[PDB]
Each structure stands twice: as C-alpha cells, then as structure tokens.
C-alpha cells in the first residue's frame, strides 16, 4: 500500500463473515485468490461484460479480441477493455463448503458480521425494466424465413 488507508485486511486464516447465500456466515480465509476478470466488449452486441480470465482464451492484454467461452458453450469474440485484479478471499465455512468471494462481500471478523440482512428484499430498486435497448433493429446478421418456411 501507498499510506495503508485501510488498517483492516483479509488475509489468510483470518476469519470473516462471507455472504452465503444471501446470508453474512462466518468463514475463515483458506487461501487468497487473485481472480483475473477480464471486461470484455462483446464483437456482436458491443456490450461490456465482465467475466472470468478462465473463459477468456488468447493473449491477455487491453485492445486484445479474444475468444471467451461463455457459459452458453459458445465462443465470442471480445475485446478486451481492462484486466481486473478481483482478489477473493477464498474462506472455508464451517459446514464444510469453501468459496471465494469479492472482499466487499466480506466482513472482517472483528466484531463485525453485519446487524443486518438484505432479507431478499425486492421494493427498492435501482434498476428498472430492462427489455432491451431502444430501437431493436440495427444488427447485420438477419436471416427470417430463409424461403425454408413461410414465416
């Protein structure tokens, strides 16, 4: 660090509340995984994901295509925008499951494990109806009926 503004830090062994499920359990780091996730400009829809350096495949560098298998088992080509260093805290809950999760998904066990639930709740929201971008017609590809059926 530069100053070190933030006296708190999750290291390994130290035990923190991670949010399992929707609910804050307390779980001790078992190891620290640097995650590379990759903001990636999808070629054909030009919108920015953020997804994991595993599914991207090429070379990893900004301005790089690279071809990120989606989870839908499709290729796509993408572009590269930043690599981002998602450190995650890898923490084995007492149940026996180990995950990693975003450090700002975890509180420090430091008499802190949140007083509070988000108790799934679905009236305030930020986002509204997501349907689509506005004016739905300005792709290349487009292939209806094909003369194959009258449709």
Not at 77 to 89: F, P, Q
């Amino acid at each position: 660090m530069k100053a070190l503004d933030e006296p708190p830090y999750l290291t390994v062994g130290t035990d923190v509340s991670a949010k399992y499920r929707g609910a804050f359990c307390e779980a001790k780091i078992k190891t620290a995984k640097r995650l590379v996730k990759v903001k990636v400009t999808f070629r054909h829809d030009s919108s920015t994901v953020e997804v994991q350096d595993d599914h991207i495949k090429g070379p990893l560098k900004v301005g790089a295509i690279v071809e990120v298998k989606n989870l839908d088992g499709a290729y796509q080509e993408a572009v590269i925008n930043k690599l981002t260093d998602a450190s995650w805290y890898t923490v084995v809950f007492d149940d026996g499951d180990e995950k990693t999760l975003r450090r700002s998904s975890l509180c420090l066990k430091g008499e802190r494990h949140f007083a509070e639930s988000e108790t799934l709740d679905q009236l305030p929201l930020t986002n509204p109806e997501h349907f689509g971008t506005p004016v739905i017609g300005k792709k290349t590809n487009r292939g209806r009926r094909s003369n194959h059926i009258p449709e």
